[PDB]
Symmetry: D3
Subunit: 150 residues, 6 copies
Amino acid sequence: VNKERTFLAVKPDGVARGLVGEIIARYEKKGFVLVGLKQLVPTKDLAESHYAEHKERPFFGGLVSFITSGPVVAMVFEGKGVVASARLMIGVTNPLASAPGSIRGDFGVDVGRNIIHGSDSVESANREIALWFKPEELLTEVKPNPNLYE
Amino acid sequence: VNKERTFLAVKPDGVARGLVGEIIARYEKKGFVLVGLKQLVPTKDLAESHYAEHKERPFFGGLVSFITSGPVVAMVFEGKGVVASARLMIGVTNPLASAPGSIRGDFGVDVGRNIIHGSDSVESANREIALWFKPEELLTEVKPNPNLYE
Amino acid sequence: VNKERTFLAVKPDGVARGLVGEIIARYEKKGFVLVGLKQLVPTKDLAESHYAEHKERPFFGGLVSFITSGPVVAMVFEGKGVVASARLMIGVTNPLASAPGSIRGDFGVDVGRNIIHGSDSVESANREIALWFKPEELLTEVKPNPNLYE
Amino acid sequence: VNKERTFLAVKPDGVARGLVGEIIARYEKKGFVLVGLKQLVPTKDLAESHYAEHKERPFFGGLVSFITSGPVVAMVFEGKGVVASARLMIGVTNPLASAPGSIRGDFGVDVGRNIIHGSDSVESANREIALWFKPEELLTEVKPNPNLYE
Amino acid sequence: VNKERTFLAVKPDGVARGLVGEIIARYEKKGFVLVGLKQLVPTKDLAESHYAEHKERPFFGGLVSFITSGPVVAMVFEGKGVVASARLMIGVTNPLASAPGSIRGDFGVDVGRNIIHGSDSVESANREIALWFKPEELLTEVKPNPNLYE
Amino acid sequence: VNKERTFLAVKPDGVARGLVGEIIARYEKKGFVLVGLKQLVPTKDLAESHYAEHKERPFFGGLVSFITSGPVVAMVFEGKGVVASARLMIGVTNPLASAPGSIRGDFGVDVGRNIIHGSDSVESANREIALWFKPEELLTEVKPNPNLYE
Ligand SMILES: Nc1ncnc2c1ncn2[C@@H]1O[C@H](COP(=O)(O)OP(=O)(O)O)[C@@H](O)[C@H]1O
Ligand SMILES: Nc1ncnc2c1ncn2[C@@H]1O[C@H](COP(=O)(O)OP(=O)(O)O)[C@@H](O)[C@H]1O
Ligand SMILES: Nc1ncnc2c1ncn2[C@@H]1O[C@H](COP(=O)(O)OP(=O)(O)O)[C@@H](O)[C@H]1O
Ligand SMILES: Nc1ncnc2c1ncn2[C@@H]1O[C@H](COP(=O)(O)OP(=O)(O)O)[C@@H](O)[C@H]1O
Ligand SMILES: Nc1ncnc2c1ncn2[C@@H]1O[C@H](COP(=O)(O)OP(=O)(O)O)[C@@H](O)[C@H]1O
Ligand SMILES: Nc1ncnc2c1ncn2[C@@H]1O[C@H](COP(=O)(O)OP(=O)(O)O)[C@@H](O)[C@H]1O
Ligand SMILES: [Mg+2]
Ligand SMILES: [Mg+2]
Ligand SMILES: [Mg+2]
Ligand SMILES: [Mg+2]
Ligand SMILES: [Mg+2]
Ligand SMILES: [Mg+2]
């Protein structure tokens, strides 16, 4: 159904490079509806619980360090199959392997400076949305373009 | 040679969403030549003949109903391998499964609101071109940029 | 009411340079609705009545021969103040003097190869629309984006 | 100095039309730095104090009514001469009179559905920023592209 | 005729900000032909000769220092009225006062970091072209799209 | 270290169709740094050594005559994995089989008119770079966007 939601965040590098609008426009053009949006500098606690699944990984320290080094634009998009779709639009972990047309493929060059984060499953999205957004910062009733769904 | 032709149609959703020029420009930039172009509100007979191969499918009634609910911009492009190349540019039937960079991948979310129709083979193109366009509405003399072909 | 219409034509040079889609997209983004659209090769009779006010001018002969020299995509847009607005978007007669952001300013360099034509008044528009299009070729039910008008 | 700030808001119509990213990208490309961003549905009280200077005007009721009818993306951009510059980039009150290249000129057609609001002076900006944003939602230390300022 | 030429240079800020292709594409779309193109780090002698008319101005020292701090992409375009048309596309000296749609208007904020240099007259163009380009680095045979000129 | 370089050349058809800027912009957005750039008309000697691995092929004769038939803009980009990445961005040899989003996929239709050349390995790149550019024509101090690399 047309009510699935995913969490996306323009990372510090994406924000410093002036890519916020370009990224949001891709999702709007696709037809997803913005239900949550804000800019904040992540707190070390937010970053660690956000990337909690990687806590025992070698790159964890630098990641948390990086994500907390500058502003991040956090957003939640709503639509049919938005979690898997937003991932397809993002590309793969290494931007060098990401196909042109995707966000990482078009703008990235390094795994550690890969512009944007996207939830990889509905469980993660629900978990991540709850982590970054309060219920009052999310639109309750969404009304998409009527020409989008049958 | 480079005289192959295909029939493409911006469906009512694509027209209402203001995507006609975006779609046309994609094919012009590729190097394909426009030999026919018109806007019309398809009739139920045209809709049913156009999609005759799906007349037994559960979605036919709704397809035909949607294709006739509003204006469509019908067009025919010419150039080498245009039938298969235009399909590649369109994406796949389900927009969510279409790669970023393709038309359906970039703009659609629902199978039923997938923006554009493109002939799936040369035999289909000939059938669909004859169905939507009268002979005199098609350019007889075509001239593609001279830097496109060897 | 905001049902004003203007006639626009992408001239043979505009069509040859692959600017049809780009031009249509500018009017679609603006919010105007396409109510008639077709590609054809103008007849001398048509070109001569179209540019009737210019017969005593030295460029008339060249003008007519050029407009009848290849495909032209003809269209009629509808919307509040479309006539004057589409003119502002086109630029001025000399493309070199047209401001960057207008169609002629962005794409043209010569007065005789100035990409597009637009009616200059509602009187000229009604007259030109009836010249290029038969009544049944124009949409009767116009449904513009509901976010466009108050 | 490079520390002036202005308040911009993508109005409900701009948000429903999928223009948020396109608008933010124009300001990022210009070099202004985003210091505040959020989406919210305005409260009738916020709207009235925001447009307080028009309280005795005929259109006031519909404006407040409209601004409160759907989500608005509120933002504050920082840079040298950003208040007057953002206005120039926005266009004039009536989008029909706005030049192509500006936001209203490119996307608008009606005075009441003019896509975006921008502070008209530094006094208004300071007043409006304070109205929509809490001090903790604004970046304190801004670091622009070093290639932007001498 | 259409053999007029102008010298344009993407300054070090424009190069560092990744605006070279955007700038070149603007002139290619207009219909101007590239007859010379190179990237070089200007020498202090070149910088001072190029900007000789400003040698008494308080900002000369800093101008020359900036123009030599990094790579510049020097280029020459040919076409009818290219000198004045390219200036119009560039904007005015102060980017904040440049109209949206022009290069400086769209991308710059500081007079000292205004992205691009364009010759201000034919006499200046001839001087600057001879100063930055050796004869053999310029195309002798130029061929503009045949749909550009009457 | 991430100082890998690749040689790219916009072929005469790419230059004639006005795609130089568009092509450069794709590599600039990606984060790669232009370290050499020039426009020239290739000499038969140069074209023949460039495409040396193809002398026994039936298309070699046509290939060489074409590359020496008009201006070519030559360039060298530097960045992490630039060689393989620029190839992914180019597409494949047959433009019709290149995926939408790649340069050849977006703009080409014929194998012999495929817009751009890119080195296929670091070995070929070092070899091609030394063929088209003298050492002093290439930047020595490379300062990429600091947000690009870890
Ligand atoms: N081996 C690695 N080296 C450096 N940083 C890494 C590595 N793999 C993961 N990262 C970083 O960690 C973030 C979370 O990683 P992961 O969840 O595996 O990928 P994705 O972000 O694509 O979901 C990635 O976006 C990336 O910035
Ligand atoms: N299972 C489905 N549910 C609803 N509509 C469908 C479905 N499959 C196809 N359609 C609609 O039928 C149109 C025709 O289908 P088909 O010819 O299979 O695909 P394509 O349009 O990609 O050639 C589709 O483009 C879509 O609008
Ligand atoms: N001095 C001229 N020389 C050549 N062609 C001209 C001249 N003046 C006008 N034209 C051509 O005649 C067309 C119609 O003229 P006019 O109605 O004056 O301009 P517009 O097209 O801006 O309304 C022009 O668009 C241009 O193609
Ligand atoms: N006469 C009018 N008719 C309808 N609504 C109006 C009128 N003038 C002002 N408005 C609306 O009120 C908002 C605030 O108006 P104003 O401050 O005058 O213009 P601006 O928004 O350009 O600063 C405008 O953006 C517009 O939506
Ligand atoms: N008052 C100023 N302060 C600092 N730099 C200036 C000033 N005026 C001009 N400049 C710098 O000098 C360059 C040359 O100036 P000028 O020839 O007057 O303008 P333009 O570059 O628009 O032709 C400008 O483009 C800008 O970089
Ligand atoms: N079958 C062919 N017919 C015509 N031209 C060809 C053919 N194969 C290759 N070419 C031309 O030769 C150029 C160099 O060939 P190759 O190295 O195989 O491809 P690529 O350019 O993708 O690396 C091609 O880019 C294309 O211009
Ligand atoms: Mg992950
Ligand atoms: Mg089908
Ligand atoms: Mg006229
Ligand atoms: Mg106001
Ligand atoms: Mg000057
Ligand atoms: Mg090769």
